[PDB]
């Protein structure tokens, strides 16, 4: 499934364009701690040979406590510059 | 030279500038015998790279006025005490060649003071410029046009009467204007036949005229790199025929678009939505009511004036993915009025940041782009953020909604902006929003019917190749209570299944030639050229109803919570 | 030249300026034999484009005083160290031509320092200007008038005694003044007969004199574009007769109004409300009580002084929504012909959310300047609702905005003219301190309109709309057992909407017939629905609804009897 969602649009963009389907650009891994979600994201990034950016929970908590969310804009701009990239938001539920 | 043809984008403010400047310039002698004050200054503002200087130069050339360009930093870079001489000499020279147009590019550098006004010499420059601008003795016909990123960046005294009394927001070009900009920027490169500039234009959302030119140049450079370099036959001047032999292919443009990085994607878009009533399959009562409320006052303003009735300028859509945003876009498209959409994330950002003055800026932008349909999508987001069952200790009032109410109360003057609100939680919406003069006309958008579902499926599958074998009416009828979002998900899943099957099949077939090289090459074409019945059956296997019947029950409750009494249904006059 | 005729708006501060300046200027020799200090400086402030410079020039011309104009940036644009020479020479030249008027346009540039006072040379300019202004040796009769957007923008020392001791807020022109401004700005364009300038004036809310001139010019340019361009017959000078043949039509003015963008719609409006007691059909006890409280102290101040009674300067309207409290306040203001200032709930909520209650001080000062005025605080309970109402915050009813309002009211009453009127739909949650003596103590209850009141409300709502005599209005009013004013307005609006839709649909179909079957002889039968009929009103009433439930009326009745005059004194008799 990860191979599909990430690799297929780039390896075969023509076939995605033929059917007029825009591939999803977001995937949310859910599961118990320590099962390899971060490793899975790294592996999927490696297979596509695309840059990998990891935003762990401490960074999000720092942005939330400091009331400085403009860093999200900077992070997204950095991810945009390093394309192809896999922007991974590890442990996104930390703020909740 | 440069003219209206060079000015691309068809953004329809060039026409306004023309109407502004012909008679003052095209017929200057007329104003000599008629007592009227022409436009002494015009403030063109918008994102950088939108061609404001190009527009001014084209107007000057097409009207014959002597164009004078006063670069912001050109004068600012000069030594203090003699830059003032440069500005004064520029105005005198422009005065000599009456009629003349004085263009001040990057005006936010000569007079950037927003009442902060740091420094000493820059205050002198701003004050002297003010004296010159207000010093126009209405003699001759010098028109001073200035360029600025935003109206509030320049000194407010420059915005006052007689200095710059009228402003035009050039704004980002739209798909139609992006296409015309591409055409103007692609006219001497001998564009290939396969490339059409239409697909690129649609995918070019977020670019400006400068961005479009840069993308075209990058595509040309990719074409030059791909070919004519392998041969490496180069001289002092490349042969014209050799260079003409190359044609910019669609692949080069696609790569350039991938390498675009548009310079202001975030900037708000003021564009006539391309959505049409065809996309929505039904809502005939809702469609007619929307047509009434919006279109009737403008199509037949005289009849509204005859009965002394002021049409409501606010409508609040409530409902469960049912197409409220699409309905608003369709209604805007029918009236051919600009559409501005304020999604929930923007409101939440204004609320978290405690910056509600952005509401004032948003309303001003909507006012400038008239006729417009200011849509506040998912307006209940702030109430949800504060709770909804218990929430905060205070009432429903919040900073952002209060500012919106203040702007609406101070609105209606413009006679063109129309506020449309969409909310999935009508119970938690602030009651003040529904008071008269606000979004009082509540419209309920129900789950799409069978016919509506068929139309939604057709709209979602219009682009995708769908085999005639797969019956769409049966699928729509089968989906008893699927929402528009659910139908879209089903169509997307079917397309995904078809794409995966096609990719896997052609990949295997390629192994088959590599493993067993056939003596004669005869491709059988695509094993799956269009979406079939089995793909749709597998996709529907995963079909799901996002909207439960309990939330539909709550919406039905609110709807009957706007109950027209139960005793007047038989009201008859005494006769 | 320019005179009182050119000065439009009839805003009634030009009269005050005249009364200020005639004797100092019109009779300068009189002050030589009488020991009195005239007005050394007058500070005209208001929104830009209101004609302050025009007013000063007109006063100078009509009084014969030598007018001198000291442009703000003209001196500011000059080189440092020699601008001071320009200011000093300007005062000396004005001194020579006594009597003279020195006008300082855009005074907020020469002396903008609000005690922040950035820079060095500008401090010199402000101090030297202060020395000159205070240096007037009371000889000659030079009067220094200055223009500024707001009083607080200029240096406070300029506002002190002897520099600028009296201020006039020209303010935005009103409908009557907007109409007069349009007349003055439309006098040489040969305005068409169809255009009346009255409808445009009413729809011109939010414009200033400059805005009105710009709108008129835009309409003229639209007329010039629509015609005389198609012919394209142009020469060095357009023929006067050819240009006169065109008449500015109502359509051109309508388009210009659509393309106006008034330069200060948000600015607060100080205007005599046009609403009259006719709009409200009843409230005779309430009407008489309001007449007493407001009108009696001014119409007969002597009798109030005789009994040594100070009339209450605060009234709090309480009642269900949509019953006409705002309209009642406007009517009472209109009867006394006093300016009306309305502070709706959104403004209070903005001040509360932004933690900026100093705006209350500014609002009260503005009300004080525009005397006689009726300062109305519409929906004053908004802050209490925002904080809760059933449980609310942990603290009491006191809040920042209400506390500032109380402080201003306590510091008020000095003016003897501002009258505070408060309207609230939730009297239970209103702060009790608001009702203490010296505050809005006179509580007035506005009940749901009666049958006669309902008839009057329906007539007022339907006065503009063409209503057929067949539709009986008394029957409709009586039929509506408990409809509020808002409910009646909604019914009338729905009936008008139904009539408009039917007329549009019918004439549209009738046009298809002409197009589908071109008739040999054109004979329009006029409008198929020329006025609102019985069927339209029946369909509209089909959707009639009672916004105000009987339970909230029960709560209001409870509070009303919660202001119960005891139960043992009703028979009080003196011993005789
Ligand atoms: C005649 C009139 C037109 C109007 O405006 C019409 C209008 N133009 N562009 C637009 S906007 C654009 C259209 C599509 C997207 C938005 N509108 C408009 C107005 C209201 C609601 N929707 C549109 C207002 C009010 C009136 C009048 C009604 C009664 C009376 S009397 C004293 O009782 O006789 C006087 C004046
Ligand atoms: C004589 C007097 C007049 C007054 O003011 C009258 C007034 N003029 N403009 C206005 S305002 C405008 C009118 C319509 C809108 C608002 N008012 C006014 C005053 C109070 C309430 N409403 C209006 C105050 C107080 C007194 C006095 C009473 C007793 C005594 S003793 C020592 O016991 O003998 C001394 C002084
Ligand atoms: N609609 C357009 N048609 C042709 N060129 C455009 C257009 N829009 C932008 N450009 C390009 O933008 C370049 C510079 O942008 P400019 O006109 O100076 O606007 P700004 O001053 O706001 O940056 C120009 O050299 C021009 O090539
Ligand atoms: N009531 C009025 N009657 C005639 N002209 C007015 C009026 N109000 C404003 N104007 C116009 O406003 C123009 C400039 O405004 P101005 O008098 O300088 O006020 P301010 O200095 O505050 O901007 C004038 O040229 C005049 O035509």
Question: Would you write up a description of this structure?
Answer:
The PDB classes it as cytosolic protein. The entry lists the keywords AAA ATPase, cytosolic protein. The structure is cut from a larger assembly and holds chains A (96 residues), B (575 residues) and C (576 residues). Chain A is globular and about 45 Å long. Chain A has helices at 2-11, 13-18, 37-48, 57-65, 70-81, and strands at residues 51-54, 85-88. In chain A, 51% of the residues lie in helices and 8% in strands. By secondary structure, chain A is mostly helical. A two-stranded parallel ribbon of chain A has the order 1-2. Chain A has 5 helices and 2 strands, in the order H-H-H-E-H-H-E. Chain B has 25 helices and 10 strands. Chain C is of the alpha/beta class and 576 residues long. Chain C has 4 domains: 4-169, Rossmann fold (3-Layer(aba) Sandwich); 175-258, Helicase, Ruva Protein, domain 3 (Orthogonal Bundle); 277-445, Rossmann fold, CATH 3.40.50; 451-558, Arc Repressor Mutant, subunit A (Helix non-globular). Chain C has helices at residues 14-26, 28-33, 52-63, 72-76, 83-96, 107-110, 121-134, 156-159, 175-185, 198-203, 209-226, 240-244, 250-258, 284-299, 301-306, 325-336, 345-353, 358-369, 382-387, 400-410, 451-461, 473-479, 485-516, 534-542, 550-560, and strands at residues 41-45, 66-69, 100-104, 143-148, 166-169, 314-318, 339-342, 373-377, 419-424, 442-445. In chain C, 41% of the residues are buried. At the B-C interface, helix 2, helix 7, helix 15 and helix 20 of B face helix 4, helix 11, helix 17, helix 19 and helix 22 of C. The structure holds the ligand Cc1cc(OCc2nnc(SC3CCCC3)n2-c2cccnc2)ccc1-c1ccc(S(C)(=O)=O)cc1 (2 copies) and adenosine-5'-diphosphate (ADP) (2 copies). One adenosine-5'-diphosphate is lined by residues 6-9, 48-54, 105, 147, 181, 184, 209-210, 213 of chain C.
Report the helical percentage of chain B.
40-55%
Tell me which CATH architecture of the largest domain in chain B applies here.
3-Layer(aba) Sandwich
What is the total tally of β strands of chain C? 10
Number of H- or I-type helical stretches of chain C = 25
User: What is the gyration radius of chain C calculated from CA atoms?
Assistant: 30 Å
Structural class of chain C: alpha/beta
Overall geometric form of chain C: globular
Largest sheet, strands/sense/barrel of chain B: 5 strands, parallel
Largest beta sheet of chain C, briefly?
A: 5 strands, parallel
Shape of chain B: globular
Using the coordinates above, name the CATH class of the largest domain in chain B.
Alpha Beta
Distance between the termini of chain B: 78 Å
CATH topology of the largest domain in chain B: Rossmann fold
The greatest interface between two protein chains, and residues involved on each side, is: B-C, 69 and 89 residues
Number of strands of chain B: 10
Count of helical segments of chain B? Answer: 25
**Spatial arrangement of strands, main beta sheet of chain B:** 2-3-4-1-5
